Amino acid sequence: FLPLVHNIIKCMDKDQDLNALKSKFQEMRKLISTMPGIHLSPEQQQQQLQSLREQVRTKNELLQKYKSLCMFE
Amino acid sequence: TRERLLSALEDLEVLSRELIEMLAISRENQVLELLIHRDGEFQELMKLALNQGKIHHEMQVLEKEVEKRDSDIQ
Amino acid sequence: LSKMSSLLERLHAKFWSETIKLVRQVMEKQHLVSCLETLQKALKVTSLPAMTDRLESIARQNGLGSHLSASGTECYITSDMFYVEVHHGENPVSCPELVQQLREKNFDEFSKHLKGLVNLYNLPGDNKLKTKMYLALQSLEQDLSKMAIMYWKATNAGPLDKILHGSVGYLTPRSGGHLMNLKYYVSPSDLLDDIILHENNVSRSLGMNASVTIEGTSAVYKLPIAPLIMGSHPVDNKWTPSFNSVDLPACFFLKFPQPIPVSRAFVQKLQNCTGIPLFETQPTYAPLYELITQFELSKDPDPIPLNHNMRFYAALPGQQHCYFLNKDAPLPDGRSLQGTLVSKITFQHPGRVPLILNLIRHQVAYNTLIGSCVKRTILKEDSPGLLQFEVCPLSESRFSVSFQHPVNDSLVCVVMDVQDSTHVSCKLYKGLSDALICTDDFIAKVVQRCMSIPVTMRAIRRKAETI
Amino acid sequence: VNLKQAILQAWKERWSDYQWAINMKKFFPKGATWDILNLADALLEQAMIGPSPNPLILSYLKYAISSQMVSYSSVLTAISKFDDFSRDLCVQALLDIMDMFCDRLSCHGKAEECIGLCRAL
């Protein structure tokens, strides 16, 4: 980000609009990198990950219980 | 986190534009140093964003396993 | 706070192309931009022309002239200091210090080296004498090298003997901006860390140092511009006399990094050995024990002054100690031990530099013996133990530690005189009806092995209590 | 308890001479003119151990002469019992102490004290 601003300052010491609009297009690229797919705080990501881990654990444990248990002999 | 990212984006944008513009109209070290701080904090948030993208890919695999175990239960 | 009104004026800007057109119209029509650049060199990413930009920023920072001939080759250029990264001499050395700093991300040490290379050639002369002045330094350096090699020819002594008692010293030749360092002393405590073996990769700061250099003075002196030792007495050095020489308005210097406190009789002894006056104006003399305590306390600084009132405490393993360093106790002349801080000793030709150093070694040795009392450990007013001691100067190079007899109740005074750098003789002084405490050779052994008062006092107490 | 222990405590905690005088009074209820207890002897022993005298205990003895705690006779006897003579500094200190009371040398007491001053001279 900032070295382009450095080049704009260096051009001001040399002298231009090109790198300024390139900085604008860079911020458009920044919007495209705000698109991804994450919105919650990382605490909420941690809560979701822990809850889903517990879900897979308990479901595997139940299915293993009924794997092992025969009601009939 | 998108709100904090986008606020850091637009803040960085138009305040860096202000620094450029006052350089241009001269021919402000404090708002310079704060721009430095905003740039560093923005890059740190982008690193946290890539980490949370990894977290979301893990979550997608994990919920696929959730649906498979639900189908086995039913 | 100001950023909030900045973002408000930024919202007003949201309510820049015209600004770029204005900058273009001004283009059709200084310090700040380069200052922002030099702040932002920290944030540049590692790349070859960007590292060229940061090295140019180092050049603008230290006042030197940068010139690139490519993205590889960049020259730092001033009146004599001329070197590249890829006057009146070649580019001598691909020195591993500057290359080792610049291969890593250590640009500030490169800046310190350019500062030192500025301070070498900032001599006041019209530049022609400057070259000759530097030549004089070169001659001095060569002579100094020979003397250490002569000592290495004399005995094959280790680096510790080279430091402690030899000619010149452990001698690190100059390399970049770091000038030539003589290590004239290393204490028995500072040798050890947390038991150091002393093989020839010894640290630059592991001891007490003195850097030799040239410096322009207000007076005029006659200095050699040729290697003065062409003929060497096979176990000594021998100097062919002057003129060659010229009367440069400068003199050689031994600059100490931390200024050494010295007594008055040291000042007369060194002005006798040198011939050149040391303190150009007479300075404000102070008692030596104030200066020794300021030296030792300002080794490791803390924002709270200790407010000692010359009563120091020592927390030891099997003992607890207290010390009164007792300035203003009168010498036989009727005055206290008065001394001042010396930092720059000026000599004219290199044959003085062993004798000078022997003097300084003597003085530094004495300071270490009074340095061991000055501590910051505050075990204040503990009823158990606190064996209350006293240090008083009977003479120059002598002092006395007085303390209660560990068995009986009369005083016992151990007088220590520092004959040489590693030799301190000791005498126990005792009442005629008392217990045998120690022999003097035991005290000399513990002193020369530790160079610290409280360790020797514990050795006295323990060898008393075994009997 | 002993005079040596009191003088040595006076050296340990740094006591000025008048505070030494007060605490020396407090340690000993019977004054016994301080010459029965041999103040001059103990002060000279624990002042003249080093090659140079410690100025604290010499300050104590010079106060104990200038103030009339100690008679001149006990001081002159305790000076007489020193000899050694290899150290010039202790001898010069003893001659300054003699320079204090000599030419004055006036006992105001019993005649046995005057005879003691005669033998001490």
mmCIF file of N, CA, C and O in Angstrom, chain C residues 395-447:
data_model
loop_
_atom_site.group_PDB
_atom_site.id
_atom_site.type_symbol
_atom_site.label_atom_id
_atom_site.label_comp_id
_atom_site.label_asym_id
_atom_site.label_seq_id
_atom_site.Cartn_x
_atom_site.Cartn_y
_atom_site.Cartn_z
ATOM 1 N N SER C 395 47.137 6.523 51.749
ATOM 2 C CA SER C 395 48.030 7.160 50.795
ATOM 3 C C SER C 395 47.489 6.927 49.397
ATOM 4 O O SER C 395 46.460 6.281 49.206
ATOM 5 N N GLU C 396 48.196 7.482 48.420
ATOM 6 C CA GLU C 396 47.989 7.061 47.047
ATOM 7 C C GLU C 396 48.443 5.622 46.918
ATOM 8 O O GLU C 396 49.432 5.219 47.532
ATOM 9 N N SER C 397 47.671 4.830 46.184
ATOM 10 C CA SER C 397 47.830 3.398 45.924
ATOM 11 C C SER C 397 47.730 2.533 47.176
ATOM 12 O O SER C 397 47.908 1.326 47.062
ATOM 13 N N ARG C 398 47.444 3.087 48.348
ATOM 14 C CA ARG C 398 47.188 2.297 49.533
ATOM 15 C C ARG C 398 45.804 2.626 50.037
ATOM 16 O O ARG C 398 45.282 3.711 49.789
ATOM 17 N N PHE C 399 45.212 1.674 50.735
ATOM 18 C CA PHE C 399 44.018 1.938 51.499
ATOM 19 C C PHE C 399 43.954 0.917 52.609
ATOM 20 O O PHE C 399 44.816 0.048 52.729
ATOM 21 N N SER C 400 42.928 1.027 53.422
ATOM 22 C CA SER C 400 42.813 0.198 54.600
ATOM 23 C C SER C 400 41.364 -0.159 54.798
ATOM 24 O O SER C 400 40.491 0.703 54.675
ATOM 25 N N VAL C 401 41.109 -1.418 55.098
ATOM 26 C CA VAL C 401 39.788 -1.873 55.470
ATOM 27 C C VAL C 401 39.833 -2.224 56.938
ATOM 28 O O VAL C 401 40.575 -3.127 57.347
ATOM 29 N N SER C 402 39.067 -1.510 57.735
ATOM 30 C CA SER C 402 39.069 -1.700 59.172
ATOM 31 C C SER C 402 37.754 -2.321 59.579
ATOM 32 O O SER C 402 36.697 -1.952 59.048
ATOM 33 N N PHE C 403 37.822 -3.253 60.522
ATOM 34 C CA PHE C 403 36.675 -4.056 60.892
ATOM 35 C C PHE C 403 36.933 -4.727 62.225
ATOM 36 O O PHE C 403 38.075 -4.902 62.641
ATOM 37 N N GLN C 404 35.850 -5.108 62.887
ATOM 38 C CA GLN C 404 35.928 -5.737 64.195
ATOM 39 C C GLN C 404 36.569 -7.114 64.091
ATOM 40 O O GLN C 404 36.364 -7.837 63.118
ATOM 41 N N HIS C 405 37.394 -7.439 65.081
ATOM 42 C CA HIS C 405 37.962 -8.770 65.180
ATOM 43 C C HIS C 405 36.847 -9.798 65.310
ATOM 44 O O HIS C 405 35.914 -9.608 66.096
ATOM 45 N N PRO C 406 36.882 -10.873 64.519
ATOM 46 C CA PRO C 406 35.803 -11.868 64.576
ATOM 47 C C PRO C 406 35.755 -12.665 65.871
ATOM 48 O O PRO C 406 34.714 -13.257 66.181
ATOM 49 N N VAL C 407 36.835 -12.701 66.634
ATOM 50 C CA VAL C 407 36.859 -13.390 67.917
ATOM 51 C C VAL C 407 36.826 -12.413 69.083
ATOM 52 O O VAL C 407 35.900 -12.429 69.890
ATOM 53 N N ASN C 408 37.819 -11.542 69.178
ATOM 54 C CA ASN C 408 37.921 -10.585 70.268
ATOM 55 C C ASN C 408 37.194 -9.304 69.870
ATOM 56 O O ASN C 408 36.382 -9.300 68.940
ATOM 57 N N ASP C 409 37.441 -8.204 70.586
ATOM 58 C CA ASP C 409 36.707 -6.972 70.354
ATOM 59 C C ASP C 409 37.545 -5.800 69.851
ATOM 60 O O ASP C 409 36.976 -4.750 69.559
ATOM 61 N N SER C 410 38.856 -5.935 69.738
ATOM 62 C CA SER C 410 39.623 -4.819 69.217
ATOM 63 C C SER C 410 39.445 -4.723 67.711
ATOM 64 O O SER C 410 38.979 -5.659 67.063
ATOM 65 N N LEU C 411 39.781 -3.564 67.155
ATOM 66 C CA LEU C 411 39.742 -3.415 65.710
ATOM 67 C C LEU C 411 40.840 -4.235 65.064
ATOM 68 O O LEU C 411 41.824 -4.601 65.701
ATOM 69 N N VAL C 412 40.660 -4.525 63.790
ATOM 70 C CA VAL C 412 41.658 -5.175 62.969
ATOM 71 C C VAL C 412 41.628 -4.448 61.638
ATOM 72 O O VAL C 412 40.553 -4.267 61.054
ATOM 73 N N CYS C 413 42.786 -3.998 61.180
ATOM 74 C CA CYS C 413 42.857 -3.209 59.960
ATOM 75 C C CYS C 413 43.748 -3.905 58.950
ATOM 76 O O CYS C 413 44.925 -4.149 59.219
ATOM 77 N N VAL C 414 43.194 -4.208 57.786
ATOM 78 C CA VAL C 414 43.934 -4.823 56.698
ATOM 79 C C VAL C 414 44.320 -3.732 55.730
ATOM 80 O O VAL C 414 43.450 -3.101 55.119
ATOM 81 N N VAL C 415 45.609 -3.504 55.556
ATOM 82 C CA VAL C 415 46.062 -2.473 54.641
ATOM 83 C C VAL C 415 46.442 -3.132 53.329
ATOM 84 O O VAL C 415 47.173 -4.123 53.295
ATOM 85 N N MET C 416 45.863 -2.635 52.250
ATOM 86 C CA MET C 416 46.109 -3.152 50.921
ATOM 87 C C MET C 416 46.820 -2.085 50.122
ATOM 88 O O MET C 416 46.335 -0.952 50.041
ATOM 89 N N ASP C 417 47.949 -2.431 49.536
ATOM 90 C CA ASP C 417 48.568 -1.526 48.589
ATOM 91 C C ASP C 417 48.682 -2.200 47.236
ATOM 92 O O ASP C 417 49.091 -3.358 47.144
ATOM 93 N N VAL C 418 48.288 -1.461 46.212
ATOM 94 C CA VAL C 418 48.240 -1.924 44.844
ATOM 95 C C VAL C 418 49.560 -1.583 44.182
ATOM 96 O O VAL C 418 49.752 -0.461 43.711
ATOM 97 N N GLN C 419 50.485 -2.537 44.162
ATOM 98 C CA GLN C 419 51.775 -2.277 43.547
ATOM 99 C C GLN C 419 51.658 -2.219 42.032
ATOM 100 O O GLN C 419 52.103 -1.254 41.405
ATOM 101 N N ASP C 420 51.072 -3.244 41.432
ATOM 102 C CA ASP C 420 50.947 -3.318 39.990
ATOM 103 C C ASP C 420 49.514 -3.690 39.653
ATOM 104 O O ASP C 420 48.615 -3.610 40.493
ATOM 105 N N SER C 421 49.311 -4.094 38.404
ATOM 106 C CA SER C 421 47.970 -4.310 37.879
ATOM 107 C C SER C 421 47.323 -5.534 38.494
ATOM 108 O O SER C 421 46.140 -5.510 38.850
ATOM 109 N N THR C 422 48.080 -6.607 38.628
ATOM 110 C CA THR C 422 47.587 -7.859 39.170
ATOM 111 C C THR C 422 48.234 -8.225 40.489
ATOM 112 O O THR C 422 48.071 -9.355 40.949
ATOM 113 N N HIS C 423 48.979 -7.312 41.094
ATOM 114 C CA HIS C 423 49.669 -7.578 42.348
ATOM 115 C C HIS C 423 49.239 -6.556 43.379
ATOM 116 O O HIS C 423 49.479 -5.359 43.210
ATOM 117 N N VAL C 424 48.609 -7.033 44.441
ATOM 118 C CA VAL C 424 48.226 -6.215 45.571
ATOM 119 C C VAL C 424 48.744 -6.909 46.812
ATOM 120 O O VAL C 424 48.385 -8.062 47.070
ATOM 121 N N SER C 425 49.587 -6.228 47.566
ATOM 122 C CA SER C 425 50.114 -6.781 48.799
ATOM 123 C C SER C 425 49.214 -6.352 49.945
ATOM 124 O O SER C 425 48.495 -5.350 49.838
ATOM 125 N N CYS C 426 49.219 -7.134 51.013
ATOM 126 C CA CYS C 426 48.289 -6.971 52.112
ATOM 127 C C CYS C 426 49.042 -7.151 53.415
ATOM 128 O O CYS C 426 49.943 -7.982 53.504
ATOM 129 N N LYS C 427 48.675 -6.381 54.430
ATOM 130 C CA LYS C 427 49.188 -6.604 55.773
ATOM 131 C C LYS C 427 48.034 -6.579 56.752
ATOM 132 O O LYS C 427 47.228 -5.643 56.747
ATOM 133 N N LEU C 428 47.960 -7.593 57.594
ATOM 134 C CA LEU C 428 47.025 -7.565 58.698
ATOM 135 C C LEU C 428 47.624 -6.720 59.801
ATOM 136 O O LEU C 428 48.828 -6.780 60.046
ATOM 137 N N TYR C 429 46.794 -5.919 60.449
ATOM 138 C CA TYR C 429 47.220 -5.127 61.583
ATOM 139 C C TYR C 429 46.274 -5.415 62.724
ATOM 140 O O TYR C 429 45.052 -5.305 62.573
ATOM 141 N N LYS C 430 46.848 -5.766 63.853
ATOM 142 C CA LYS C 430 46.173 -6.479 64.912
ATOM 143 C C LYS C 430 46.689 -5.971 66.241
ATOM 144 O O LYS C 430 47.835 -5.529 66.345
ATOM 145 N N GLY C 431 45.834 -6.014 67.255
ATOM 146 C CA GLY C 431 46.303 -5.772 68.599
ATOM 147 C C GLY C 431 47.264 -6.855 69.049
ATOM 148 O O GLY C 431 47.252 -7.979 68.547
ATOM 149 N N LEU C 432 48.131 -6.491 69.997
ATOM 150 C CA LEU C 432 49.180 -7.407 70.435
ATOM 151 C C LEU C 432 48.594 -8.601 71.177
ATOM 152 O O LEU C 432 49.169 -9.693 71.167
ATOM 153 N N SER C 433 47.450 -8.416 71.814
ATOM 154 C CA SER C 433 46.726 -9.512 72.443
ATOM 155 C C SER C 433 45.461 -9.757 71.637
ATOM 156 O O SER C 433 44.418 -9.160 71.906
ATOM 157 N N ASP C 434 45.548 -10.643 70.645
ATOM 158 C CA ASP C 434 44.386 -11.006 69.848
ATOM 159 C C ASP C 434 44.551 -12.435 69.350
ATOM 160 O O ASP C 434 45.552 -13.098 69.622
ATOM 161 N N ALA C 435 43.546 -12.886 68.611
ATOM 162 C CA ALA C 435 43.538 -14.209 68.005
ATOM 163 C C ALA C 435 44.204 -14.147 66.642
ATOM 164 O O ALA C 435 44.148 -13.116 65.966
ATOM 165 N N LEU C 436 44.844 -15.243 66.247
ATOM 166 C CA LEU C 436 45.345 -15.343 64.885
ATOM 167 C C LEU C 436 44.193 -15.450 63.905
ATOM 168 O O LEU C 436 43.309 -16.299 64.049
ATOM 169 N N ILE C 437 44.202 -14.588 62.895
ATOM 170 C CA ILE C 437 43.115 -14.553 61.931
ATOM 171 C C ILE C 437 43.566 -15.224 60.644
ATOM 172 O O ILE C 437 43.024 -16.261 60.255
ATOM 173 N N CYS C 438 44.577 -14.654 60.002
ATOM 174 C CA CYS C 438 45.010 -15.128 58.701
ATOM 175 C C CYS C 438 46.466 -14.759 58.514
ATOM 176 O O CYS C 438 47.016 -13.943 59.258
ATOM 177 N N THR C 439 47.083 -15.358 57.513
ATOM 178 C CA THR C 439 48.378 -14.878 57.068
ATOM 179 C C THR C 439 48.184 -13.919 55.902
ATOM 180 O O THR C 439 47.153 -13.934 55.225
ATOM 181 N N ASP C 440 49.188 -13.064 55.685
ATOM 182 C CA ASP C 440 49.070 -12.007 54.682
ATOM 183 C C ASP C 440 49.054 -12.571 53.271
ATOM 184 O O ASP C 440 48.408 -12.006 52.381
ATOM 185 N N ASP C 441 49.767 -13.674 53.045
ATOM 186 C CA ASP C 441 49.823 -14.261 51.718
ATOM 187 C C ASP C 441 48.483 -14.858 51.325
ATOM 188 O O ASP C 441 48.134 -14.884 50.139
ATOM 189 N N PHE C 442 47.708 -15.308 52.311
ATOM 190 C CA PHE C 442 46.342 -15.720 52.037
ATOM 191 C C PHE C 442 45.503 -14.546 51.557
ATOM 192 O O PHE C 442 44.693 -14.690 50.630
ATOM 193 N N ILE C 443 45.712 -13.367 52.149
ATOM 194 C CA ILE C 443 44.943 -12.193 51.756
ATOM 195 C C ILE C 443 45.350 -11.761 50.361
ATOM 196 O O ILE C 443 44.501 -11.390 49.540
ATOM 197 N N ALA C 444 46.643 -11.846 50.063
ATOM 198 C CA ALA C 444 47.119 -11.517 48.731
ATOM 199 C C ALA C 444 46.579 -12.489 47.702
ATOM 200 O O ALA C 444 46.226 -12.088 46.586
ATOM 201 N N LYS C 445 46.444 -13.764 48.078
ATOM 202 C CA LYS C 445 45.906 -14.762 47.161
ATOM 203 C C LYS C 445 44.444 -14.497 46.846
ATOM 204 O O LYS C 445 44.048 -14.524 45.676
ATOM 205 N N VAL C 446 43.637 -14.235 47.877
ATOM 206 C CA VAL C 446 42.218 -14.018 47.642
ATOM 207 C C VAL C 446 41.996 -12.715 46.883
ATOM 208 O O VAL C 446 41.143 -12.644 45.988
ATOM 209 N N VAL C 447 42.814 -11.694 47.163
ATOM 210 C CA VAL C 447 42.683 -10.412 46.474
ATOM 211 C C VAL C 447 43.024 -10.563 45.002
ATOM 212 O O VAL C 447 42.256 -10.151 44.132
#
